[PDB]
Design a protein around this ligand. Structure first.
Ligand SMILES: CCc1nn(-c2c(Cl)cc(Cl)cc2Cl)c2nc(Cc3ccc(O)c(O)c3)[nH]c(=O)c12
Length: 298
C-alpha cells in the first residue's frame, strides 16, 4: 500500500508475504503482511474481515499487536508491530551452548500468559512454531499470527510449495478430530519446550503418518485407558502398531523433575486431560522465575 515505504522482505510466511515497512504519516517501523490470493481476492470474505477485525481488540503484552487492517483494492493487508528476531533463529544461534534455563523458563512463563489471555476469549492459535515466536532486546517474547491461523485456513503447501510443518501438531488433529480445543496450543508449546532443552525437535515428522507414529513411539500407542474415545476417532486405525511408552528422563535430559512433570501434563494424550495455560502458570516449575535479558547483537 502507498502510505508504506517498504524496507525489506522479512520472510515468506504462510498466509503471504511479510515486509518490514515504514509508515509515512506515523513514522513507525512495522510488519506488513500481504495476505495470499484467495484469501485476498476476490475480495475478502465478509467473514475473513469480521474475524480479523476482532483480533484488533485482543491486545496483550505477549501478543504482537495488530496495528491496522487495510481492506482496500480488494486486497488485504495487515500491519503488525515489528519484531527484530524470531525464536527459531535464536535457537539456531544458541545451538552450541543451548539456551540458558532461566531464559527458557522466562520464555515459557510469558508464552503461557498470552495463550491464557487468548484462550479466555476463546481464541486459539492452531499453528504454534518457533518461527512465529518473536523476541526483543528487553528479554521478551510474543505470539505472532494468532487467530489468522484459522480465519483463512492453514495451507498445506507453504509457500511456495515446500510443506507447512507437522512437527508441532497435536494428535487429535492428526487423527481427524474436527472440533478441537485450546489443548492443541498446549500440545505445541510442550513440543516447543522440549526443543529448547534438548536442542532437537521432539517429533520431526515428514508426513502425517510419520508424525503420528513418531509420537506413538515415544509416548506409547494410545488405548482407551489413557484416551477414552480414541478408537472411534476418524482416521484411527486398529492396524496402528502398538509401541511402548518411553520414560521422560530419556527423552528430555537433563530437565529437572518439576520440568518433567510440567512437560508430561502438556503432553497428555487426552485433550481434556492436558494441563491448561492457567494451571500451568501455577506449576512449581515457575518457582524461581526471573526475567533475563538475552544476547542479541546487530
Ligand atoms: C509479526 C510480523 C512478522 N511476521 N514474521 C514471520 C512469522 Cl511470525 C512467521 C513466518 Cl513462517 C515468517 C515470518 Cl516472515 C516475522 N518475522 C520476523 C523475524 C525477522 C526479522 C528481521 C528479518 O530481516 C527477518 O528476515 C526475519 N519479524 C517480524 O516482525 C515478523
Amino acid at each position: 500500500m502507498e502510505n508504506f515505504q517498504k524496507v525489506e522482505k522479512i520472510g515468506e510466511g504462510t498466509y503471504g508475504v511479510v515486509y518490514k515497512a515504514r509508515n509515512k504519516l506515523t513514522g513507525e517501523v512495522v510488519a506488513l503482511k500481504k495476505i495470499r490470493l484467495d484469501t485476498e481476492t476476490e475480495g475478502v470474505p465478509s467473514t475473513a474481515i469480521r474475524e480479523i477485525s476482532l483480533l484488533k481488540e485482543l491486545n496483550h503484552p505477549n501478543i504482537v499487536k495488530l496495528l491496522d487492517v487495510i481492506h482496500t483494492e480488494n486486497k488485504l493487508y495487515l500491519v503488525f508491530e515489528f519484531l527484530h528476531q524470531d525464536l527459531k533463529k535464536f535457537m539456531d544461534a544458541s545451538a552450541l551452548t543451548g539456551i540458558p534455563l532461566p531464559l527458557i523458563k522466562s520464555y515459557l512463563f510469558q508464552l503461557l500468559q498470552g495463550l491464557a489471555f487468548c484462550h479466555s476469549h476463546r481464541v486459539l492459535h492452531r499453528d504454534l512454531k518457533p518461527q512465529n515466536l518473536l523476541i526483543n532486546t528487553e528479554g521478551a517474547i510474543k505470539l505472532a499470527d494468532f487467530g489468522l491461523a484459522r480465519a483463512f485456513g492453514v495451507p498445506v503447501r507453504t509457500y511456495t510449495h515446500e510443506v507447512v510443518t507437522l512437527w508441532y501438531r497435536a494428535p487429535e488433529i492428526l487423527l481427524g478430530c474436527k472440533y478441537y480445543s485450546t489443548a492443541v496450543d498446549i500440545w505445541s508449546l510442550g513440543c516447543i519446550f522440549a526443543e529448547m532443552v534438548t536442542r532437537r525437535a521432539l517429533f520431526p515428522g515428514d508426513s502425517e503418518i510419520d508424525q503420528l507414529f513418531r509420537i506413538f513411539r515415544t509416548l506409547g500407542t494410545p488405548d482407551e485407558v489413557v484416551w477414552p474415545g480414541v478408537t472411534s476417532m476418524p482416521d484411527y486405525k486398529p492396524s496402528f502398531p502398538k509401541w511402548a511408552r518411553q520414560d521422560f528422563s530419556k527423552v528430555v535430559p537433563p530437565l529437572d523433575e518439576d520440568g518433567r512433570s510440567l512437560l508430561s501434563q502438556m503432553l497428555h494424550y487426552d485433550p481434556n486431560k492436558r494441563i491448561s495455560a492457567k494451571a500451568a502458570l501455577a506449576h512449581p516449575f515457575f518457582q524461581d522465575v526471573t526475567k533475563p535479558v538475552p544476547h542479541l547483537r546487530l
